[PDB]
Amino acid sequence: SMGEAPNQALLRILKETEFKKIKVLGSGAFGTVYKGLWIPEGEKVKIPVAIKELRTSPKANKEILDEAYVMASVDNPHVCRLLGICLTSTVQLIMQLMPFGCLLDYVREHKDNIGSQYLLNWCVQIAKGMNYLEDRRLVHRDLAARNVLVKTPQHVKITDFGRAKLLKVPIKWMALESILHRIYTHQSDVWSYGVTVWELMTFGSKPYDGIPASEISSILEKGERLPQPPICTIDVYMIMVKCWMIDADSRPKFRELIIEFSKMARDPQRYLVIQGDERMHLPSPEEDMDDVVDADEYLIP
Numbered sequence: 001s002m003g004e005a006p007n008q009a010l011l012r013i014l015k016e017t018e019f020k021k022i023k024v025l026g027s028g029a030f031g032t033v034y035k036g037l038w039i040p041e042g043e044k045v046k047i048p049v050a051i052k053e054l055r056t057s058p059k060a061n062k063e064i065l066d067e068a069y070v071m072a073s074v075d076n077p078h079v080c081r082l083l084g085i086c087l088t089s090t091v092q093l094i095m096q097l098m099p100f101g102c103l104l105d106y107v108r109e110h111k112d113n114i115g116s117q118y119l120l121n122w123c124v125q126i127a128k129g130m131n132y133l134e135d136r137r138l139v140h141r142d143l144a145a146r147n148v149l150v151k152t153p154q155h156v157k158i159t160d161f162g163r164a165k166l167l168k169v170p171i172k173w174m175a176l177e178s179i180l181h182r183i184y185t186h187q188s189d190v191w192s193y194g195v196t197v198w199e200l201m202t203f204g205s206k207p208y209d210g211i212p213a214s215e216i217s218s219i220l221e222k223g224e225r226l227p228q229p230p231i232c233t234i235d236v237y238m239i240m241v242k243c244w245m246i247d248a249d250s251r252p253k254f255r256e257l258i259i260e261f262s263k264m265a266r267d268p269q270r271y272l273v274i275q276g277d278e279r280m281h282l283p284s285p286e287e288d289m290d291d292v293v294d295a296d297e298y299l300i301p
Ligand SMILES: CC(C)(O)Cn1c(NC(=O)c2ccnc(-c3ccccc3)c2)nc2ccccc21
Pocket: 025, 026, 027, 030, 033, 050, 052, 080, 095, 096, 097, 098, 099, 100, 101, 102, 105, 149, 159, 160, 161
């Protein structure tokens, strides 16, 4: 070809009869998400799934199918992949179940059991997910802690490709040039990565809390950034500050962020100071659960 390489991803279409809905997991601007089980007809397999549904019209269907295109196209351990779609009256996106929910809600609810090792490992895993999207020439355009999900406390993945593109908006996560000039690059995703880290290191504090969205661009033009979280050493805070430069190229690349956070993750208590960091433990690995298989172990030929 002359331009981008051909996208040879498989869009799998699933029957309504192949999966059960168990309960509702959430409802908001993103849509409505149900817990379910996907049982492929001719296989001794049960797959825990999230089933997304909109909150029916041509506008809704076009926009949700664009998201399905992008999700079906990605394949990385730190990115949520689409398992398939279902063509009932309402188009349903069938995704891998992330049992522990989004990372923002997780850090809020488990603040008193989250250690430096978990926080820094999460930063590494998000950076890998984003670096992969950069390899696929994809700008996420909505990276935040709410859009990172938790498969296990050890394993997180990036989600929500409803604004993802090739190379009411979230003003407080966006780079300055995105707010002013609608310019979006992988480096604008780095700014958002910085804000995402700040969310985690503050245990899910709202950025610029009280300051309205219209004040943000002039605040950033003057040079005011998000403050240093109590637990953050200058080493970690410097990296956030580097993500928030005016010059987009002067910000770090995701590959460098993988490197720096993985160096720090080898000696976590040198880079994050948390009271009682040693004694903390988070969980580690009704229904007939015998033939249950996680989607990550269910690979299509
Ligand atoms: C929105 C909410 C309530 O925080 C999501 N929530 C989930 N969510 C997924 O398992 C999932 C998987 C894959 N993708 C998504 C997606 C995709 C696009 C845009 C938003 C969410 C979502 N699992 C939960 C388990 C317990 C409690 C809450 C859970």
